[PDB]
Amino acid sequence: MKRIFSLLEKTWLGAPIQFAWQKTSGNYLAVTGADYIVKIFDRHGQKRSEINLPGNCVAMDWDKDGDVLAVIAEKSSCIYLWDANTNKTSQLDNGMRDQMSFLLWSKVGSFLAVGTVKGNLLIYNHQTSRKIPVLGKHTKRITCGCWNAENLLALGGEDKMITVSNQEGDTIRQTQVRSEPSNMQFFLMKMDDRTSAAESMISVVLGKKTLFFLNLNEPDNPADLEFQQDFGNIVCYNWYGDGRIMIGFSCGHFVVISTHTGELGQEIFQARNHKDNLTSIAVSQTLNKVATCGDNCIKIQDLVDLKDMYVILNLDEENKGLGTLSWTDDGQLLALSTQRGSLHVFLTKLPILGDACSTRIAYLTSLLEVTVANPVEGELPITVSVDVEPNFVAVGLYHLAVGMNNRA
Numbered sequence: 001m002k003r004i005f006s007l008l009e010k011t012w013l014g015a016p017i018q019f020a021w022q023k024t025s026g027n028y029l030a031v032t033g034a035d036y037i038v039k040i041f042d043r044h045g046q047k048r049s050e051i052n053l054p055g056n057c058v059a060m061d062w063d064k065d066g067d068v069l070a071v072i073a074e075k076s077s078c079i080y081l082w083d084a085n086t087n088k089t090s091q092l093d094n095g096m097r098d099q100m101s102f103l104l105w106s107k108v109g110s111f112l113a114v115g116t117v118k119g120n121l122l123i124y125n126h127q128t129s130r131k132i133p134v135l136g137k138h139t140k141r142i143t144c145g146c147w148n149a150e151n152l153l154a155l156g157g158e159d160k161m162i163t164v165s166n167q168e169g170d171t172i173r174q175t176q177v178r179s180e181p182s183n184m185q186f187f188l189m190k191m192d193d194r195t196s197a198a199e200s201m202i203s204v205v206l207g208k209k210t211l212f213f214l215n216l217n218e219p220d221n222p223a224d225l226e227f228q229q230d231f232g233n234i235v236c237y238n239w240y241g242d243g244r245i246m247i248g249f250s251c252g253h254f255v256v257i258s259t260h261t262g263e264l265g266q267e268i269f270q271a272r273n274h275k276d277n278l279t280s281i282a283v284s285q286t287l288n289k290v291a292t293c294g295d296n297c298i299k300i301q302d303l304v305d306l307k308d309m310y311v312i313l314n315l316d317e318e319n320k321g322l323g324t325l326s327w328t329d330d331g332q333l334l335a336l337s338t339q340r341g342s343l344h345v346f347l348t349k350l351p352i353l354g355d356a357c358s359t360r361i362a363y364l365t366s367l368l369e370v371t372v373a374n375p376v377e378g379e380l381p382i383t384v385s386v387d388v389e390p391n392f393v394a395v396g397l398y399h400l401a402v403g404m405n406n407r408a
Contacts, residue, residue, distance in 0.1 A: 120138075
């Protein structure tokens, strides 16, 4: 693992940043701090675009293809939409009277959800330009939510309610919870019968202390998991494999639990990876690995055997107070924020891009360097510097091609 770049803007020093990777291609990284700007970087750390806001960024998210970034701000009714293929910004007025509090795209349809401080919801379809306002969805601030594989939307609010909806904003289900919902995620229970494929169940963190479960097929029997007070508060959690959750806790501990029928909440594994503080976990199902950050270090482990430490990185004393981790969906890059307002990006895996024509081969050797060789004829390897990170490479008798999205 090598550090590719670091962002240290003077305007961010002393305040926690927020950031988001582009969802399929991973070419762009959106970042914001206390300066009322969202800055869009390429994967080399060069600034490609900026979005000015009338107040703090409240939330940001990318569409299912990564073609569009959505942003919401304090004291604004406008959603800001930025397009990765044109580099342009546009504005979309929410049509409600209110300050926004939540933002999330579907993984399957071109649908964007927006929540408000008064508990109103808007769904926007980007392909049809259709707006769907839903007044009174919650009685207080919408705080969290998730989109299903079937384009169902689930939402939590400060009114201690959970609501489940279709893509047309209609309420399918409502439920009351013991404390404020946070970090909500949809999933599928793997029953022994192969015949069910829909994500029938929701997971959520209540009060930063308990993980709660709601089944849409059995809504009269929800489940609460409590954890040892010595672990501290739930900081984050992620889904893995067939029916597992990994949960990170503030006092340096993480836990893995089973969610299979008759073992729901059984602890499979536990570790104190960090002595004093754990601040984020990020799981890549693409690489089959997890990163954890705490005590000014990053620790990376195999999801097949969590005892096998892949990498430990220590970070210099300027970086005190780690923030959030997130990978690109190709599992090529890891980003880390700090509570002091810096961002750092690391190479987790070189892309295995290569091609052949007769005895001549081309292959990626660094993120911007393709090497061409002919190991049969004994020709010395030729190193080609390239202007972009390629998503594909091809070679001929006399030429090399590399390309990304719709360009070569």
